[PDB]
Amino acid sequence: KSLKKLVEESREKNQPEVDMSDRGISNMLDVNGLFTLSHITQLVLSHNKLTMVPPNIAELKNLEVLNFFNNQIEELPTQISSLQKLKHLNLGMNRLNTLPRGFGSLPALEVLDLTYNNLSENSLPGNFFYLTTLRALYLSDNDFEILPPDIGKLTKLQILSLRDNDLISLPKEIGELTQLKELHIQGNRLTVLPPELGNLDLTGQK
Amino acid sequence: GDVCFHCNRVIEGDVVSALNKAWCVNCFACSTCNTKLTLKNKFVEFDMKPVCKKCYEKFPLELKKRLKKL
Ligand SMILES: [Zn+2]
Ligand SMILES: [Zn+2]
Protein backbone atom coordinates (compact mmCIF):
# COMPACT_ATOMS: atom_id res chain seq x y z
CA LYS A 1 0.00 0.00 0.00
CA SER A 2 1.06 3.61 -0.59
CA LEU A 3 2.27 5.74 2.31
CA LYS A 4 -0.77 7.97 1.81
CA LYS A 5 -3.05 4.96 2.24
CA LEU A 6 -1.16 3.65 5.28
CA VAL A 7 -1.67 6.98 7.04
CA GLU A 8 -5.34 7.04 6.01
CA GLU A 9 -5.92 3.46 7.18
CA SER A 10 -4.18 4.19 10.48
CA ARG A 11 -6.45 7.18 11.06
CA GLU A 12 -9.67 5.47 9.96
CA LYS A 13 -9.28 2.16 11.80
CA ASN A 14 -7.43 3.90 14.64
CA GLN A 15 -4.50 1.51 14.26
CA PRO A 16 -1.82 2.30 16.85
CA GLU A 17 1.06 0.74 14.86
CA VAL A 18 2.54 2.21 11.68
CA ASP A 19 5.04 0.18 9.66
CA MET A 20 7.00 2.13 7.06
CA SER A 21 10.18 0.07 7.04
CA ASP A 22 12.19 0.09 3.80
CA ARG A 23 9.94 2.49 1.86
CA GLY A 24 12.62 4.77 0.39
CA ILE A 25 11.60 7.63 2.68
CA SER A 26 14.09 10.54 2.68
CA ASN A 27 12.08 13.09 4.68
CA MET A 28 9.42 12.50 7.34
CA LEU A 29 7.75 15.80 6.38
CA ASP A 30 7.00 14.26 2.99
CA VAL A 31 5.04 11.35 4.41
CA ASN A 32 1.56 12.79 3.82
CA GLY A 33 -0.34 13.26 7.09
CA LEU A 34 2.14 11.31 9.22
CA PHE A 35 2.26 13.88 12.02
CA THR A 36 -1.55 14.09 12.26
CA LEU A 37 -1.60 10.53 13.64
CA SER A 38 -1.61 11.57 17.31
CA HIS A 39 -3.05 8.25 18.48
CA ILE A 40 -0.21 6.00 17.31
CA THR A 41 2.02 4.16 19.77
CA GLN A 42 4.47 2.52 17.37
CA LEU A 43 6.24 4.02 14.36
CA VAL A 44 8.74 1.94 12.40
CA LEU A 45 10.94 3.80 9.92
CA SER A 46 13.86 1.38 9.73
CA HIS A 47 15.84 0.99 6.48
CA ASN A 48 14.90 4.32 4.91
CA LYS A 49 16.91 7.33 3.76
CA LEU A 50 16.37 9.75 6.63
CA THR A 51 19.13 12.23 7.44
CA MET A 52 17.23 14.22 10.05
CA VAL A 53 14.15 14.02 12.25
CA PRO A 54 11.96 17.11 12.31
CA PRO A 55 10.74 18.82 15.50
CA ASN A 56 7.24 17.66 14.46
CA ILE A 57 8.08 14.30 16.04
CA ALA A 58 6.79 15.84 19.28
CA GLU A 59 3.28 15.85 17.79
CA LEU A 60 3.24 12.04 17.92
CA LYS A 61 2.81 12.40 21.65
CA ASN A 62 1.67 8.85 22.40
CA LEU A 63 4.60 7.00 20.82
CA GLU A 64 5.86 4.08 22.90
CA VAL A 65 8.05 2.50 20.22
CA LEU A 66 10.04 4.56 17.72
CA ASN A 67 12.38 2.79 15.32
CA PHE A 68 14.87 4.61 13.07
CA PHE A 69 17.28 1.68 12.65
CA ASN A 70 19.55 1.86 9.57
CA ASN A 71 18.93 5.34 8.25
CA GLN A 72 21.53 8.09 7.74
CA ILE A 73 20.46 10.34 10.58
CA GLU A 74 23.07 12.94 11.56
CA GLU A 75 21.05 15.01 13.99
CA LEU A 76 18.03 14.72 16.25
CA PRO A 77 15.76 17.57 17.41
CA THR A 78 15.54 18.45 21.09
CA GLN A 79 11.85 17.58 20.69
CA ILE A 80 12.82 13.89 20.65
CA SER A 81 12.95 14.02 24.45
CA SER A 82 9.41 15.42 24.76
CA LEU A 83 7.90 11.98 24.14
CA GLN A 84 6.44 11.23 27.56
CA LYS A 85 5.35 7.68 26.78
CA LEU A 86 8.38 6.53 24.78
CA LYS A 87 9.74 3.21 26.05
CA HIS A 88 11.75 1.89 23.08
CA LEU A 89 13.98 4.09 20.90
CA ASN A 90 16.06 2.48 18.20
CA LEU A 91 18.68 4.77 16.70
CA GLY A 92 21.00 1.98 15.63
CA MET A 93 22.97 2.15 12.41
CA ASN A 94 22.84 5.88 11.75
CA ARG A 95 25.36 8.72 11.52
CA LEU A 96 25.14 10.15 15.02
CA ASN A 97 28.18 11.61 16.72
CA THR A 98 26.04 13.93 18.85
CA LEU A 99 22.76 13.83 20.76
CA PRO A 100 20.62 16.93 21.31
CA ARG A 101 20.44 19.15 24.39
CA GLY A 102 18.26 17.54 27.04
CA PHE A 103 18.11 14.08 25.41
CA GLY A 104 18.15 12.55 28.88
CA SER A 105 14.78 14.11 29.73
CA LEU A 106 12.78 11.17 28.35
CA PRO A 107 10.81 10.05 31.41
CA ALA A 108 9.77 6.50 30.45
CA LEU A 109 12.58 5.21 28.23
CA GLU A 110 13.35 1.53 28.88
CA VAL A 111 15.34 0.38 25.87
CA LEU A 112 17.76 2.65 24.03
CA ASP A 113 19.64 1.32 21.03
CA LEU A 114 22.52 3.46 19.76
CA THR A 115 24.47 0.60 18.15
CA TYR A 116 26.67 1.41 15.14
CA ASN A 117 26.94 5.17 15.14
CA ASN A 118 29.89 7.51 15.73
CA LEU A 119 29.38 8.14 19.43
CA SER A 120 31.89 8.61 22.21
CA GLU A 121 31.65 9.74 25.81
CA ASN A 122 31.90 13.30 24.52
CA SER A 123 28.71 12.71 22.52
CA LEU A 124 26.57 12.18 25.58
CA PRO A 125 24.48 15.14 26.75
CA GLY A 126 25.06 16.48 30.22
CA ASN A 127 21.80 14.91 31.37
CA PHE A 128 22.16 11.55 29.62
CA PHE A 129 22.23 9.62 32.88
CA TYR A 130 18.92 11.06 34.02
CA LEU A 131 17.49 8.20 31.93
CA THR A 132 17.08 6.17 35.12
CA THR A 133 14.19 4.08 33.78
CA LEU A 134 16.55 2.34 31.33
CA ARG A 135 16.60 -1.48 31.39
CA ALA A 136 18.71 -1.97 28.26
CA LEU A 137 21.37 0.27 26.75
CA TYR A 138 23.06 -0.74 23.53
CA LEU A 139 26.24 1.18 22.66
CA SER A 140 28.09 -1.42 20.59
CA ASP A 141 30.05 -0.42 17.48
CA ASN A 142 30.87 3.09 18.63
CA ASP A 143 33.92 5.09 19.70
CA PHE A 144 33.79 5.16 23.51
CA GLU A 145 37.19 5.25 25.16
CA ILE A 146 35.87 5.87 28.66
CA LEU A 147 32.50 5.11 30.17
CA PRO A 148 31.48 7.76 32.71
CA PRO A 149 30.98 6.64 36.33
CA ASP A 150 27.44 8.08 36.04
CA ILE A 151 26.51 4.75 34.43
CA GLY A 152 25.88 3.72 38.05
CA LYS A 153 22.78 5.93 38.14
CA LEU A 154 21.01 3.62 35.70
CA THR A 155 20.12 1.31 38.57
CA LYS A 156 17.48 -0.65 36.62
CA LEU A 157 19.88 -1.63 33.85
CA GLN A 158 19.70 -5.31 32.93
CA ILE A 159 21.65 -5.13 29.68
CA LEU A 160 24.71 -3.02 28.86
CA SER A 161 26.21 -3.64 25.45
CA LEU A 162 29.65 -2.13 24.84
CA ARG A 163 30.97 -4.51 22.17
CA ASP A 164 33.52 -3.13 19.71
CA ASN A 165 34.15 0.25 21.24
CA ASP A 166 37.60 1.56 22.17
CA LEU A 167 37.34 1.17 25.94
CA ILE A 168 40.61 1.16 27.82
CA SER A 169 38.90 0.63 31.18
CA LEU A 170 35.49 0.15 32.80
CA PRO A 171 34.07 2.20 35.68
CA LYS A 172 33.73 0.47 39.07
CA GLU A 173 30.17 1.80 39.18
CA ILE A 174 29.08 -1.00 36.85
CA GLY A 175 29.42 -3.15 39.97
CA GLU A 176 26.55 -1.15 41.49
CA LEU A 177 24.11 -2.29 38.80
CA THR A 178 22.37 -4.96 40.90
CA GLN A 179 20.04 -5.98 38.06
CA LEU A 180 22.71 -6.37 35.38
CA LYS A 181 22.48 -9.69 33.50
CA GLU A 182 24.33 -8.98 30.25
CA LEU A 183 27.57 -7.04 29.88
CA HIS A 184 29.01 -7.18 26.36
CA ILE A 185 32.62 -5.97 26.36
CA GLN A 186 34.32 -8.00 23.64
CA GLY A 187 36.35 -6.10 21.04
CA ASN A 188 37.58 -3.28 23.26
CA ARG A 189 41.09 -2.47 24.51
CA LEU A 190 40.61 -3.64 28.09
CA THR A 191 43.59 -4.84 30.11
CA VAL A 192 42.95 -4.77 33.86
CA LEU A 193 39.68 -3.91 35.61
CA PRO A 194 38.81 -2.43 38.99
CA PRO A 195 38.40 -5.23 41.57
CA GLU A 196 34.75 -4.19 42.07
CA LEU A 197 33.87 -5.70 38.69
CA GLY A 198 35.39 -8.98 39.83
CA ASN A 199 36.38 -11.64 37.30
CA LEU A 200 34.81 -10.51 34.02
CA ASP A 201 35.82 -12.55 30.98
CA LEU A 202 38.18 -10.28 29.03
CA THR A 203 38.24 -12.63 26.04
CA GLY A 204 38.18 -11.09 22.57
CA GLN A 205 39.80 -7.72 23.17
CA LYS A 206 41.31 -6.00 20.13
CA GLY B 1 7.29 -15.81 36.62
CA ASP B 2 9.15 -14.82 33.46
CA VAL B 3 9.07 -11.13 32.55
CA CYS B 4 8.80 -10.03 28.91
CA PHE B 5 11.96 -8.36 27.63
CA HIS B 6 9.81 -6.10 25.48
CA CYS B 7 6.79 -4.98 27.50
CA ASN B 8 8.37 -5.58 30.93
CA ARG B 9 5.28 -7.33 32.30
CA VAL B 10 4.88 -10.81 33.73
CA ILE B 11 4.05 -13.04 30.77
CA GLU B 12 0.47 -14.30 31.10
CA GLY B 13 0.31 -16.54 28.04
CA ASP B 14 2.92 -18.91 26.64
CA VAL B 15 6.54 -17.89 27.16
CA VAL B 16 8.85 -17.45 24.18
CA SER B 17 12.37 -18.33 25.41
CA ALA B 18 15.36 -17.28 23.36
CA LEU B 19 18.71 -15.59 23.82
CA ASN B 20 18.58 -16.01 27.61
CA LYS B 21 15.48 -13.84 27.68
CA ALA B 22 11.69 -14.22 27.60
CA TRP B 23 8.92 -12.63 25.50
CA CYS B 24 5.15 -12.70 25.28
CA VAL B 25 4.09 -14.54 22.13
CA ASN B 26 2.70 -11.31 20.72
CA CYS B 27 5.75 -9.28 21.77
CA PHE B 28 8.47 -11.44 20.21
CA ALA B 29 9.61 -9.52 17.18
CA CYS B 30 12.57 -8.47 15.09
CA SER B 31 14.64 -5.92 17.02
CA THR B 32 15.43 -3.94 13.87
CA CYS B 33 12.08 -3.82 11.98
CA ASN B 34 9.67 -4.93 14.73
CA THR B 35 8.05 -7.55 12.49
CA LYS B 36 6.46 -10.29 14.58
CA LEU B 37 8.52 -13.46 14.91
CA THR B 38 8.15 -17.00 16.20
CA LEU B 39 10.93 -19.47 16.99
CA LYS B 40 10.09 -21.15 13.67
CA ASN B 41 11.15 -18.01 11.76
CA LYS B 42 14.68 -17.46 10.48
CA PHE B 43 16.55 -14.95 12.58
CA VAL B 44 20.06 -14.20 13.75
CA GLU B 45 21.48 -13.15 17.11
CA PHE B 46 22.87 -9.60 17.29
CA ASP B 47 24.01 -8.54 20.77
CA MET B 48 21.59 -11.19 22.01
CA LYS B 49 18.64 -9.59 20.21
CA PRO B 50 16.71 -11.31 17.43
CA VAL B 51 17.22 -9.87 13.94
CA CYS B 52 15.14 -11.31 11.09
CA LYS B 53 16.95 -12.64 8.01
CA LYS B 54 15.71 -9.85 5.73
CA CYS B 55 17.01 -7.21 8.14
CA TYR B 56 20.36 -8.91 8.64
CA GLU B 57 20.98 -8.85 4.86
CA LYS B 58 20.77 -5.05 5.01
CA PHE B 59 23.60 -4.78 7.56
CA PRO B 60 26.87 -3.22 6.36
CA LEU B 61 29.18 -5.70 4.71
CA GLU B 62 32.06 -4.86 7.05
CA LEU B 63 29.90 -5.76 10.06
CA LYS B 64 28.58 -8.96 8.49
CA LYS B 65 32.15 -10.00 7.75
CA ARG B 66 33.23 -9.36 11.33
CA LEU B 67 30.26 -11.23 12.79
CA LYS B 68 30.93 -14.23 10.56
CA LYS B 69 34.67 -14.49 11.32
CA LEU B 70 33.68 -14.35 14.99
ZN1 LIG C 1 5.34 -8.71 26.36
ZN1 LIG D 1 13.55 -7.41 10.71
Author numbering:
A (entry chain A): 3 to 208
B (entry chain B): 249 to 318
Quote the original article.
Ras suppressor protein 1 (Rsu1), a leucine-rich repeat (LRR)-containing protein conserved from human to worms, was recognized as a major FA component and is important for FA formation and cell motility. Here, we solved the crystal structures of the Rsu1/PINCH1 complex and found that Rsu1 strongly binds to PINCH1 through a large concave surface on its LRR solenoid.
The complex structures of Rsu1ΔC/PINCH1_LIM5C with one crystal form at 1.65 Å resolution and Rsu1/PINCH1_LIM45C with two different crystal forms at 2.2 Å and 3.15 Å resolution respectively were determined by the molecular replacement method. Consistently, the deletion of C-cap results in the disruption of LRR9 in the Rsu1ΔC/PINCH1_LIM5C complex. These polar and hydrophobic interactions are interlaced with each other to provide the complementary binding required for the highly specific recognition between Rsu1 and PINCH1. Interestingly, although separately distributed at the interface, the polar interactions are well organized together by forming a hydrogen-bond network. Interestingly, the very C-terminal sequence (aa.308–325) in PINCH1 is indispensable for the binding of PINCH1 to Rsu1, as the LIM5 domain alone without this C-terminal sequence lost the Rsu1-binding ability.
